[PDB]
Design a protein around this ligand. Structure first.
Ligand SMILES: [Zn+2]
Ligand SMILES: [Zn+2]
Lengths: 160, 76, 149, 153
């Protein structure tokens, strides 16, 4: 039997979830991922002066119907360093697909994209750079393998 | 002084400026870090599109003020 | 199971307002032959609900030279639900209640078997092509210039 | 029937909820993840200051290779905005970049409010007034802002 609870963000947004007393805290973070797009790694749930652990249930924490939870985003402060490790993912993020680079290549201006992402932009042999609008030709695509090695390094870091 | 600047993808970068430094002065530091020419940069603060002439304190940009970067645009 | 894998998926869900904004632009751009025209009744209605259409009578018919103004209303379920259609200029055509201008969606296929692929332009173009048919091509018409109220 | 929403749209939606921009609000519709309901604040030091302007935004099937569709849902006095809220802005057409996002599109729209262009207009009747007497047009934009864009949420 599903029940309703509320998860309010510090921004002001309130979320309504259909949950069960037997749901673990990680089950709720998955329901938050499907509805809000936020991955479970970046979720820290709060209820009644306690931080909640993924292995325990809503019933363990006396979370009944119409209970209000507080969602905090990336509350914790480090995996190496919170903000700095985040900056490393952003440097290897494709500006087009917003995912980590897949076969990263550079164009004339020096900006780098996924090979397939920039190839779609330059259908016909060329276009303008999405970041700086300088003209580029697909024949001058240049592999940027250090960015790809950086992606796997960070992916290994994520899974320890 | 220190200012945050949110780039096109959303990545935030820190910069070294002065209250007296012009807007194009900030664009140069953005160009060195991000490779966007100043003529294609548009910096937004409080919704108003900053003109290259004036200074940071002409817009009351204190420290840890977050600017937002946008591409060159024109109404038509 | 109830669902199966499909390799290709196209046609995202376009909100009602943006579908209506597209139909507004085509009517403003004069797209088509010129025998039909469509647009908003009040150009401040942000809901894009109340529309007004035009239809020129076809040649080789009884409606030749006759300009017909129409009013169309796209409800909150458009373009899934069909729109209400009406006639501003009094007319004699099979499938329309004779003292109203309201269109019997039953007696017109485009509104009876309604799709989401159908636009207001088609409801007007096929209504003029419906007026081309044999039965109403020889129907007697009232004095042009008289309307309902 | 159903297909996966593109990851870029998932990412943009999650970062609109996690890192909001001051003066800009964007929220997806419950029935359509490509449909966004927007409120932007009028730019400082403009006749639109203090106003809250409602917009709706749609991500078409070709996004981000194509620009988002966006229009005002609030009446506004602007030469590049017609009376139904449609906007003529170059980054929404020929000057679109797939590196632009909902966040930077909305920031560019309020940048358009701070830089109206009556020389290349969408609403020619509004622009003719902006060119005849710009001081009166700015006052009218300020009056329209209080009439339609205050206490409207
Ligand atoms: Zn990519
Ligand atoms: Zn570039």
């Amino acid at each position: 039997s599903h029940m309703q609870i509320f998860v309010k963000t510090l921004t002001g947004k309130t979320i309504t979830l259909e949950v069960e007393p037997s749901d673990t805290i990680e089950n709720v973070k998955a329901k938050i991922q499907d509805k809000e797009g936020i991955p479970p790694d970046q979720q820290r749930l709060i209820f009644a002066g306690k931080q909640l652990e993924d292995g325990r249930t809503l019933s363990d924490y006396n979370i009944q119907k119409e209970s209000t939870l507080h969602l905090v985003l990336r509350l914790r402060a480090a995996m190496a360093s919170a903000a700095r490790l985040t900056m490393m993912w952003e440097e290897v993020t494709c500006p087009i697909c917003l995912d980590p680079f897949v076969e990263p290549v550079s164009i004339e201006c020096g900006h780098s994209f996924c090979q397939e992402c920039i190839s779609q932009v330059g259908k016909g042999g060329g276009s303008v750079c999405p970041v700086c609008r300088q003209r580029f030709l697909l024949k001058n695509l240049r592999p940027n393998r250090q960015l790809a090695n950086m992606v796997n390094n960070l992916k290994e870091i994520s899974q320890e | 002084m220190q200012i945050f600047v949110k780039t096109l993808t959303g990545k935030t970068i820190t910069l070294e400026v002065e209250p007296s430094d012009t807007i194009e002065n900030v664009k140069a530091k953005i160009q060195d870090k991000e490779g966007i020419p100043p003529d294609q940069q548009r910096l937004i603060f409080a919704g108003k599109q900053l003109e290259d002439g004036r200074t940071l304190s002409d817009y009351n940009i204190q420290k840890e003020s977050t600017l937002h970067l946008v591409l060159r645009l024109r109404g038509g | 199971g109830s669902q199966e894998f499909m390799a290709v998926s196209t046609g995202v869900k376009v909100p009602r307002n943006f579908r209506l904004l597209e139909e507004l632009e085509e009517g403003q751009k004069g797209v088509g032959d010129g025998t039909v025209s469509w647009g908003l009744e009040d150009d401040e209605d942000m809901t894009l609900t109340r529309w007004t259409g035009m239809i020129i009578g076809p040649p080789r018919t009884n409606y030749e030279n006759r300009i017909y103004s129409l009013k169309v209303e796209c409800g909150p379920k458009y373009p899934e639900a069909p729109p209400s259609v009406r006639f501003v200029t009094k007319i004699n055509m099979n499938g329309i209640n004779n003292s109203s201008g309201m269109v019997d969606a039953r007696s017109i296929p485009v509104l009876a078997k309604w799709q989401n692929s159908y636009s207001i332009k088609v409801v007007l173009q096929e209504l003029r092509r419906l007026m081309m048919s044999k039965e109403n091509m020889k129907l007697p018409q009232p004095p042009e210039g008289q309307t309902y109220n | 029937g159903m297909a996966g929403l593109p990851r870029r749209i998932i990412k943009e939606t999650q970062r609109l909820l996690a890192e909001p921009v001051p003066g800009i609000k964007a929220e997806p519709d419950e029935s359509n993840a490509r449909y966004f309901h927007v409120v932007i604040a009028g730019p400082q030091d403009s006749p639109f200051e203090g106003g809250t302007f409602k917009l709706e935004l749609f991500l078409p099937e070709e996004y981000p290779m194509a620009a988002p569709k966006v229009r005002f849902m609030t009446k506004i006095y602007h030469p590049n905005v017609d009376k139904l809220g449609r906007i003529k802005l170059d980054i929404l057409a020929d000057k679109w970049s797939p590196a632009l996002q909902i966040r930077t599109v909305l920031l560019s729209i309020q940048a358009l409010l701070s830089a109206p262009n009556p020389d290349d207009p969408l609403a020619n009747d509004v622009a003719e007034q902006w060119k005849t007497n710009e001081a009166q047009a700015i006052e009218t934009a300020r009056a329209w802002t209080r009439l339609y864009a205050m206490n409207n949420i």
